[PDB]
Amino acid sequence: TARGTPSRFLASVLHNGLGRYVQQLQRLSFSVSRDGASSRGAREFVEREVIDFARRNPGVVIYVNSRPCCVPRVVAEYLNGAVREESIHCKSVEEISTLVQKLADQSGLDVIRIRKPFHTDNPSIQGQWHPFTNKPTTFRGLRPREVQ
């Protein structure tokens, strides 16, 4: 639900679109077992696709570890210190290309609820409403039942 889960406002990291766009994903960390059916589609991802992925965005540095793991993981680390560890356990090569491309596309913000679908920081341009907009002044600033 939304009352048990925390929420946040829709933001970016360092005004991520204004001047230039910066890839928010620093490191990927694959740990892939050499012998093991859990990390089969990980291995076929390293043999085929992790090199072309590593060239399609050079701001990401990638660490394939190749240790005897029993469940393979990928660890995305973001520019703001966020670390999202997701498992590639028994997933095919295409599903790891969509998973790794999903981690590449997003940012190090939490995946908790976002309150508003938008974020202006200058919401009002003609001046915000206060109760004395749309009220005409009177002569000498007089209020009702005031004589002088």
Partner RNA sequence: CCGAGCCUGGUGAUAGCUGGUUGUCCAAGAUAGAAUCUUAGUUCAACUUUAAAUUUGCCCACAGAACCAAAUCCCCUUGUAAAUUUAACUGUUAGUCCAAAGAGGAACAGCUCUUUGGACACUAGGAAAAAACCUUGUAGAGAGAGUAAAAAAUUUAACA
Partner RNA sequence: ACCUCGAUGUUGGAUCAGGACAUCCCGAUGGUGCAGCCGCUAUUAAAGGUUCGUUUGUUCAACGAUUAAAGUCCUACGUGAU
Partner RNA sequence: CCUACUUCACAAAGCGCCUUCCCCCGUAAAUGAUAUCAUCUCAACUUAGAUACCCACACCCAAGAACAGGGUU
Write out the residues near RNA by the rule CB under 7 A.
Answer: 115-117
- Tracing tokens 């590639």 back to the chain, one arrives at 88
User: According to CB under 8 A, which one of 58, 67, 134, 140 is a site residue for another protein?
Assistant: 134
Beta bridge partners of 86: 74
Q: How far is the CB of 77 from another protein (least distance, A)?
A: 16
Site string for another protein, 8-27 (x = CB under 8 A): --xxx--xxxx--x-xx---
Asked if 71 and 36 count as a contact pair (C-beta separation under 8 A), the reply is no
Q: DSSP letter at 143?
A: P
Instruction: Compute CA 137 distance to the chain's CA centroid, rounded to the nearest angstrom.
Output: 49
Query: Taking CB under 8 A as the rule, does residue 113 contact another protein?
Result: yes
Alpha-carbon gap, residue 77 to 97, rounded angstroms: 17
Stretch that binds another protein, among 67-75, 80-88, 119-127 (CB under 8 A): 119-127
With contacts defined by CB under 8 A, name the span among 67-75, 79-87, 140-148 that binds another protein.
140-148
Amino acid sitting at position 124: S
Task: Please state, in angstroms and rounded to a whole number, the distance separating the CA atoms of residues 82 and 10.
Answer: 16
The residues of the shown chain that bind another protein, judged by CB under 8 A, are: 1-2, 5, 10-12, 15-18, 21, 23-24, 34-35, 37, 40, 43, 102, 104-107, 109, 111-114, 117-135, 143-146
